[model samples]
Target: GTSSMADIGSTNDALDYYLKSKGFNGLFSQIELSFSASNLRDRDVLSKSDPMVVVYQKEKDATLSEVFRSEVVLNSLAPKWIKKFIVAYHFETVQTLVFRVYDVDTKFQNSREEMLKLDEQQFLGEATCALSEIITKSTRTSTLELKRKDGFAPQAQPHHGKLIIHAEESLASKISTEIVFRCSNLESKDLFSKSDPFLVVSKIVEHGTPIPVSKTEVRKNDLNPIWKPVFLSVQQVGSKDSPVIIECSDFNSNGKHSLIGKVQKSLSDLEKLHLAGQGINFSLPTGAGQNKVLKSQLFVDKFTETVHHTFLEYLASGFELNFMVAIDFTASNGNPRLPDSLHYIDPSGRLNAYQRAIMDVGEVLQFYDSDKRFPAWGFGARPIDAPVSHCFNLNGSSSYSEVDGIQGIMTSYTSALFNVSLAGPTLFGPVINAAAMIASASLAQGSRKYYVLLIITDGVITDLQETKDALVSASDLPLSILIVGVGGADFKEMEILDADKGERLESSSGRLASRDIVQFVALRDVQYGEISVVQALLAELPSQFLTYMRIRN
Candidate 1:
């Protein structure tokens, strides 16, 4: 703050004399002190140069060095500060991002094969840097050149039919052809996981309700995703009805489908499969119009992209059985004339249709069921296993032999007829409940298993209300019932139990079973009683098998 380089005055003259005496020393002190004053800190500033120092590499060995002492407070607080800075300054989202780590280290020596093991930390760092770029990419755009083909395009994913995509380079810079349907299935409750399909439009020009695009690396799971009609353009293919089935090769391939594409099927083949003739149309999201063709995968392989099996895969492992039997019993000639009878065998001495029907259905079913140890009980009669008080195992008893397969069913039926006597008053609920116990017990074991009860009965059901409750309760367990009612005794109640009917039979507690578990049929209405009876009974097997498989059994 002294006048700009003013010359020293009177006091300087005396000082000049003294300075001459103290020559070299005064000159050295003056120059060095002035240099030090230039860099002196002001009250306002904190940092002089670098904000913090790099933790010094004091150790030359692989292990932590004894000479090194970490700055604990700085190390602990540094991460939080870094996190805040990243959130505040830089982050965006892209459509797809492969989490790959580069293998470029001295330990790796670029040996190619052996390099895989050396990338533990190398990939860690690259992934972090790459993530910044991945997220910084746009969220919505059109994916063009998605295929080598030319001409027009179709409605893209979300193919919801209302979006109008118009991607600009500036907008393109702001978005990517990448789109993500995060919880499509989970939201709809149809299934779960990356059931949500997405498209990358880094190339196409997308507009309207921009299909959500992100680069979070959500997984692709299960068998191929069965996209709804909305995303497909069936007209371009051959048919104009079914959604165009597009397939892409493995994401690991050099093809367009190497990482992100559809099931790989020929155009002509896709058309032939669509019965409705709707065009195959899946328009790009917004940017990849001429650049990114989706990957080709198996119709069954699409969702398998991420090494995760869909809920549907587990659905195929288990098996199902449908059992419907019509018991036919009428007093044609005479009764055994006994007070209590298995069938009231007479002088004519033979089992009626009820016995025949029971044995027939039982024998046919023995072929499909895994368990030869059958649990048989009757409705109109008390438990065949019951004693003077009552019993169960109506088809066969222990005295004769162990029933196994169709032969066993017939033998048991014959023996069952000889043993017990049939009275009147048919009560179906109690018998079904008794047999249902086996299924419930298996269910309690926590394994996915199947059990079917074929109640072939003639005449009106005395306890219709209770039967409905039993059926509803059994729906949750492996137990499923097929009531084949014989005779024309006002079979109206049978219709109530039919799952196809609008009104499903409900129990006293109103918890509607998620699926149609009980299938009921009346012997009177269905035609070709013998053939159709068998065919219709087996129809529900596929679905039943699938139901258990989805539960991860």
Candidate 2:
């Protein structure tokens, strides 16, 4: 159960009351579950929550996480609170926000200097606003400036509790999936359920499988103060000759709107809303909103523009991607010719589950940079051509050639569905290495290429070391692997290879796969499995693909 319903009962009750007070009718997306409990066998302990959610993690979808800077000096005189400590914690967790202060305090000159340096240099430079950023740039004095060279004239103190979240860790994922919790919508309560809350973090699938989250962050205080409609003036009413002065509605949020770009123009064209700049010329009209009808329209237009800017995100996908798909057609697939086999395309005209899965992924992936061709090859099985090649030339010399470009890949995949025969004794090494070679070559050419070895196998690998080495090398080469298991065989090894959480992994050389770019999405995923026979099954590929792109970009 998440919380009891009474104000005197549980956290949920308190939350509901807060929402009601704010006139929020269940419109808030997630609740900030804040609670307090100290003294767990230790007193002076300030511990970070093993870190559950991070600021760089997604919030409201498209608003990118950026750095926010805030500097606070003790006026050159130390305050006796001498406990002058600084700890950084995120709002994602309500259970607890652990700010583990550094082992030392500001009492020592070195410590104080370090602390001041951290606040000024590192922290502020990384703090980020949740949904907006302070616009501060100088379009003045570029070539020459004698006066009025202020840029983004901001109110000294814009808003109270303006929290600026900044990234704390760039290498590790900011989210913790190990802890999953389900809120029990239990109605009747009083006796603490004999059991504790059954909590399970949504999914700790590391960098690959993800839910919206924030990352290294900084907050710009609390609710970003909304500028209330201001009253207008008599002399400044119709001043076509000079700039109109628009005073901020709330003093607390005063300096905030002050930094906004000012422009020439008033709502006088529409009536009631006047525009102003305190001798500071700007871009948008931002002074009065007295016209009820006109203000309402203005509010709607502003809201629309805000949302349009936030969510209308489209990646410039023309950046070409080259993927080389190495399939496992080894004897492990069971005989494709056999009727009862997992690879069997039934006489009933029903496609085998394995083929269906492959098609599902390919269909979805085709939509992303499909213009960037993917080379498909097979391993373990004898080719339709003579010499039964087991290496880069798995699909036969002619068949092995790069699928005749993008469309050719589609045609070859479909045609190979009917042509290639099943034959096992799987060796996961050769195929991976070959594709890795291609990916490396592409990378050398300064092209962002990836090697995706989709091993739909029913049995164990005969060359685990070789495969591991190849994957480890490929892991560093901007390549990823996806293992989709078919049949009731033990696919555990494949699952372990993905190492989404980053904790469990050890390559043949005792080295961990650089960053585990692999994804082990079981075809058995109950929620997504067969239902996702459409392209959407792989709809997230571009995002996964672009994590590399964005980082590199």
Candidate 3:
């Protein structure tokens, strides 16, 4: 097959170079380019040269190939050309790119023959650079000194003019991001008080107005203000080096906020700031009088993306998350038969808080679990006419607890409430241990399996000290605990277990959690009708997942 294919065309080796070119392969990326000329020399006494630009790509053998030719801009020394060139880019190899400037003689300006060569024609100057130089850098222009076409003048004479060029990569490489803007030592507008500072972040568009995307809440009287982080969509933050403007203003109750200062940077500029724990400081140009020397420093406190560790990156390393559900059936939940009770099984068919919390967390986690089967348990409950037990399967069996799916778990949960009686001093230690046992066994196999324990209850735990011991022991395993308080009870004790405010939880046995594996949220603390119930529950999962893997490695 190879011999027959090579014989189709005859020249050298039975095929011409053009015929041989058909079997070639190449790799390419995309580059977008624009050009402008600065202080271009006027060849004619009456006018500046009608300037046009042509760019060429040089191969390894020093042969030039034409890539792009721009339209003519009339009678301007410093012309910002509107025509853009879209060209192919390559990696792992150096590709030389060259630019040539021309002064069109009104008639032959559009002639293709005139553009192909620079000898004895209206050639002004030429500049040479590489494709990677523009792709890796921000929007700052690079200047190329102009050289005369055929000079008979003194060799030491100064060159004619300079060309400024800018380049950018295509949009497919952009990643969406979130950023927080914090400003300190802002310039004051009011004579008596500090500036009521608020910041406005905007994106500059081509041939259009600057669109405002986010603004900070005004700091009433403080010179230093930390604004809430702004989440940017893919469209808003198109590429890392896209132009963004930040304006600090002295906010007023009336119509206008006096401008304190303004600065512009590409998105990539802000990222570099975070690495060094530093800020970018820029002052307002002396436009608002001599006192307008308002200087402000900006810092990015937090910046992250969705799938920060990337789901694929985690799975590629053999990591998986397994989910387990545990319910709190203590007396605080009240009788399941009473309509006024928190655990009342209503006939109206609307999901109770318990059902809502369970479904929200279960659905998202089920995707990561290899097996659809999940273990479901009930704590602080006793079977009818039987002794009280701290932990038991909800499926009415002592030997088995694992159920087939979320629906299976849900069904077991409802059926258990009827057969089980709400009885006991609330205890979480035993149920936590049950989950820890399963996680411990999984770890013994030397595989990457993580466990999440979801415990929903209506009251505070009575086994605080014992529960702390269990959590501390479980922390060393691949386990994270999610505790949800589902009713209007005093949940202050639960918050202590959550440890969100930098408090380290230690057991009476003097063991500490390897890391924070608990997230506690009260259903009553949610806004009037908001959907934040499950958001807080799983908010710490990603960080916890990363924390376990990092420490294990």
Candidate 4:
């Protein structure tokens, strides 16, 4: 019976799962790219080329989409554009970018970037590259040779010029401030009773309208209400001194809400207000040119700023994510010789659920690992008349468990199926302990490494409490556990190990896990969905990695 699969309860649960899978992967940090060019082809006879750069992202369908266009740099062979283009960096996929240079016409030099048309400008040169080509460099910069619109001419001898792109991960993306707002003696707007108060904070842009950044929950029947803290990030407000609009409103059961008061203050000013223990008077616009100041005031109860170290920051600081794999070789997986068995290797080029899980997750993580070597193991199998071993190397070597790459892992796993006898009683404690030992050793050496262990199992674990004990113990180390269930077994117990929605794993001695180190997913759950298996498995890994880094500090 598929009892475990049926437990995916409501539409809300599925929606949350879909949203989280979409939200987490490849949303690490923003990359700011600055461009400069040298020795450009002169389009004007009287002066140097007024070069303007336009960047386009090459989409998956072989189409170019314009991302940004820089302002015209007047009369210079070598020009550095002051306007930077910000693009999101996704580690899983290759982001191909194209740079096209154009010389702005003299008549259109005074016009803005939005007003100038690309067809009217003279085309200079173009360059193309992958975003990772710039980021993987030690200096985070790459220079590409410029070519003609159609192709480079073989007979042309003169240099076509070069486009230099420098990439920098935005530091502001990692910082955020939590602010608690409180109001004193607020004027009630309701006729019968006290008004329910709430707050909305909006960031004031230079040319556009105000963008609402945060909102607080409404407190009922309270004139002097202290609302919950709202988080504002540096990326949202641009800077600490940037102007923001803070408005308090009286809540109503209908969709309409009445504005109680409004105040314009920067984050720096709010910090000052918190430090001085002072309140600013609220104002309401009564007429076209006049404002009525009210006796009620707004105060900042708490202002706490925090910096969250991003995944890219850790990677830039020489931190590596080591990948490891452990495959189940238990009897419940059925005979490897049979076509219906989960362990069967197809004669054609089709992958089983286990191979699919490994390839999907491994391809994404291989970019983060410095060395391609990965530790590969097989559990619950007996090899060549030996006793059943729960944590035996898949390579069949007594001294070495490490494989060359993801392909090496797949090769070893395929060979191990033929050599080993499938045994009974699936257990995870031994493999978890093995991975934890490596993590503990890395911690002892003071190395900046994080370990991710992927376990592909086909049956329920026999040693439940022992696995919990191992996970709770390993949570202190820089290790994360990912469990992918391939077959339809009663995996209700696996949900207990995954601490994302429930309490942290506790050992038999009442010791709690340091953090949520386990992420479990059933392969059948996401097979038919829009989300891929890798996205579902790796959704919580960044947060888990960040949590471990924070607790150690």
Candidate 5:
């Protein structure tokens, strides 16, 4: 026998009462479900039950109402649902949501009554949770636990499923938009059969450049074709008033797609045409204004603004980027007194090779570093105050190495060049370890700080084995190493350490780098090419920065 409505009490009554007393900032969430695996009760004798999920909002009056339903997936234990539900979100109230799984039996005559009745469908399981738990999470993804309705023992029921969801605030001003378009009287470019026509939609950005956002499938031998509805985001098309350029193209078997015509339409313009039941009809714009009969049409099927968090929203949140510097003071760089020396400063107030490399990379990193305070150190140097040290503070004081800014770091580098004589063969292991220590400390501080270590070297690495070991060990930390060979007595070894050829650096202790963390470029190569020193150094930074954040999440 089934229990009555009063038997199943409100699961979130305490939370609802507490939230009602305290007000919350309004935020609407766009929810998407991704389930790689699911388990459902078998309702048929020979086959598994067809499964579908329906989301409901538990009302204050203790009634369950459907919010959204997923498309039915037939005869499967594991399912992935691409459907998403957009709902007005409130945290001030209980805001309870329930996920109900059912075995859809469609063997009977197709009727709304058969599908709508709960008794007609076999109940698998249901999961209930509050909306507040989803938004307050550090990560946007949540794993929901499902349990059978008639539960006596936990393992007694095998027909339960788990659902994973990605929830975030909508990026658009409106709820959701479905773009529907039909092309009428499109000009055919192919001389053979009727043009194999397709449409490409592009969003215009700054500098008048258009970026292709989506493409429609090719419709063969048809001058007029109705396209499937394409879902779009306000972030994709700047706004409702933002113009989207659509290009009609004739497909060539050789893979060269020829342009037939182009027309631009704003969401506002499309809405007007949609409401009037007259879809967009116009001539494609031409450069020479010599159009005879080249015209096409576009239409808007549906449009609504919904809440979503932009991808760049994390940039405004608590994200930190820290910069550190390591300079090579090897004796092979020649005497600083000579003009040809890498460290030799000119009387004409021009920067030397070492100073140029520092300024080039430091300037770009300073913007993201915010605090402008950088830790600068020199390797392979013997100071008057101490013995030959591989890693020593360039600013003289040992306890405090962070300078005010990049200018201060450069000033300290010039001072250290005069005081500390270039000594020993080049060794990178010490400096890498020093910078890695700082990066490791910040990994758990909840600051989300990423460290970039810049190394300016003059000669080949003296301790190649030790350098590889250090890099391998430090690769897992939130760190990126940029090494610039200044004088370049032969940078073949530096390229080997760069690991751009796909083989990762292996340590003497048999440990492989978890990821590529080093970028090396010669200073002479910089002067000879179109690429700036900064560009070559930071080209892989964005990908590496995101990789670190992804793994942590």
Candidate 6:
């Protein structure tokens, strides 16, 4: 048993932690949104309305900030905007978008978009939605009913129109380019010593706004400095041929950075420069709108592009995330016969903590698993005259631990509460080991299955060391553990097992765990209204799965 735990705990813990953390932040993808309107109000007296849409993002304080504005389409009630808005999609947060449609008057039709006075334009209608609402749809498109800014009038028509929003996850989200830049400069800003130069790479977005994507560290006292490699995703720069501004600046202690020079180049141009082993001259703006091309040049030492496969791609390629659940049946959960128990089944059909945790996580994961059969277990309970079994099938089956579906698991759980007696001293080791054995067997059979074992518990574990050993051993397998602490018995110790704060679990015999394989969340700490318990619990799952897949390769 000890050998199994030690066998799985052999890898660099710090690097694993770094990769996990990096992957977590990098998981957010850019969503490109396209908008169209149908049956918009005709504000003009002679012709149809020249409709334009302005998108605004709702802030936390209920204020709306303008994000994007579309070009006015002349003489059309149904208008599709050619220009798109790119917004970052975060799985953990809710992003609300407000779209206001305005009919541009013929007087300002030829005016530049920036010069268009929005207040002078006639208000047509508006639509509002969350970004997730668009992306989660099977078609990646959502239709929202357009409503007037003011309250509905009694004489006004019932139909206001419809705003159709479509979302596409950028393909560039999976691709990242790492480039190492070195500069050979003759000009120096510092009087005492050589200039400490650094580079800032920014994407030139629509309307000439420079969005900084990557920055390098300040190289100390060196004119010819090869700073660290900077990573830029295709999502950040739009495309390989999109123009980006790379600015070199001299570092100052007074928080004022003097610009050395800047160059506008696309990623394709930089790659060509790298391939030709050439340097490009850096330019500065003169007083008369002319560039002062200097003798100083920027060189690309290395350029590497990598494509990371997404979770959806793996799922499309026949990879399955199998869901398994383990329920805590410790005596600390209270007697099941009493209504105060954590396991109590409400007569009004309300769910308990354990049931909520199960439904919260299981419902989301059920779609990914093809067969829908889940291995369900119960720990720290005495079953039907048997001794206190730390690990037993919830269905009371001696031969198989797999249940039919989420409903089957729920049924078995309710039946187990009546048949089993809750015992003392909650222990996670046996159930974890049991899950690990199943995952290992799947690997042995050459199955493309990733097992997700969800442990819903009410109290602290008694076998902390044993649990650590089991988790370390299981880290090597295609398995991830999600622990949801229900009713909160000071779940501070469980955080160590999650290893999310750049700390990896180590076995008792000085063996470091391979990677972060656990995600622990207390149900009480979760903001139920904002983000669900399942979102917080399963947020790290994709990255964890990707980490294992990448490491195995």
What TM-score against the true fold does each predicted structure earn? 0.40, 0.41, 0.48, 0.68, 0.46, 0.62
Lowest lDDT block of 10, candidate 1: 26-35
RMSD of each: 35.6, 27.2, 26.6, 10.0, 24.1, 11.0
- Candidate 6, 393-425: lDDT as tens digits: 999999889999999999999998999999967
Residue 482, candidate 4: alpha-carbon lDDT? 91
Q: What is the lDDT of residue 19 in candidate 1?
A: 23
Candidate 6 regions off by >4 Å? Answer: 1-17, 24-170, 181-230, 234-298, 304-306, 525-530
lDDT of 3: 0.71
Candidates in descending TM-score order: 4, 6, 3, 5, 2, 1
In model 2, the runs with Cα more than 4 Å from the true position are 1-314, 370-372, 384-389, 392-395, 398-400, 404-421, 448-453, 501-504, 525-530, 533-553
Per-residue alpha-carbon lDDT of candidate 5 for residues 1-553, written as tens digits (9 for 90 to 100): 1122232123123223222221111223344434433545442232465667788899756699887787666667676665666765432234678888777776632444325666777777788876645544457566776676564776765546666666655554324466667777766655555666667778887777898765665666677877655556565677779998888887665557777777678877777877887755545445776544355665555554443232124433646567899988878777788888888878898888788777777765665555778999999989996789999999999796788888998899889889998898778989999998888888767566789999988788878888889898888898989988877478886788774643567888887776678888888834632345557557566556655555453
Whole-model alpha-carbon lDDT for candidate 4? 0.81
Model 4 stretches with alpha carbons more than 4 Å out: 1-28, 36-82, 90-138, 142-164, 178-276, 280-298, 301-308, 525-530
Candidate 4 TM-score, true structure as reference:
0.68
User: How many pairs collide in each candidate, listed in order?
Assistant: 107, 53, 2, 0, 12, 0
Model 1 residue 302 lDDT score? 16
Better of 2 and 5 by TM-score: 5
| lDDT agreement with native, every candidate | 0.35, 0.37, 0.71, 0.81, 0.68, 0.81
Which is the better candidate, 1 or 2, if ranked by TM-score?
2
